[PDB]
UniProtKB/Swiss-Prot annotation:
Organism: Homo sapiens
Family statement drawn from the similarity comment of this UniProt entry: Belongs to the FKBP-type PPIase family. FKBP1 subfamily.
Top-level taxonomic group: Eukaryota
Localization per record: Cytoplasm; Sarcoplasmic reticulum
Protein name: Peptidyl-prolyl cis-trans isomerase FKBP1B
Claim: Cytoplasm is one of the keywords in the record: yes
Record comment: activity regulation: Inhibited by both FK506 and rapamycin.
Length: 107
């Protein structure tokens, strides 16, 4: 149940595919909560590829439904990332996650 809320500008055609390593200025946000993660702090904009199940399921589905330069807004359901378990100390069980995601990539 990933729902994409794209802020318009970009190109709308460079969609990510398999075997493509991409670069994202993400930002973690907790619904009814504060931030927990930001690529903008360390300023190393998180090079990662698509399909090797590295990232969570909600961020993986939202990455393929964006394009180059676009700025979407994720709303991650609990069942796709951690809502059964919860990452200990950082993510409580049954949490709904918010992400500001911009795709400024290669490949």
């Amino acid at each position: 149940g990933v729902e994409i809320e794209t802020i318009s500008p970009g190109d709308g055609r460079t969609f990510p595919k398999k075997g493509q390593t991409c670069v994202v200025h993400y930002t973690g946000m907790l619904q009814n909560g504060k931030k927990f993660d930001s690529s903008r702090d360390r300023n190393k904009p998180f090079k990662f590829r698509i399909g090797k199940q590295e990232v969570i399921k909600g961020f993986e589905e939202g990455a393929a439904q964006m394009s180059l330069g676009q700025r979407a807004k994720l709303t991650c359901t609990p069942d796709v990332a951690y809502g059964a378990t919860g990452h200990p100390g950082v993510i409580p069980p049954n949490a709904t996650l918010i992400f500001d995601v911009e795709l400024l990539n290669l490949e």
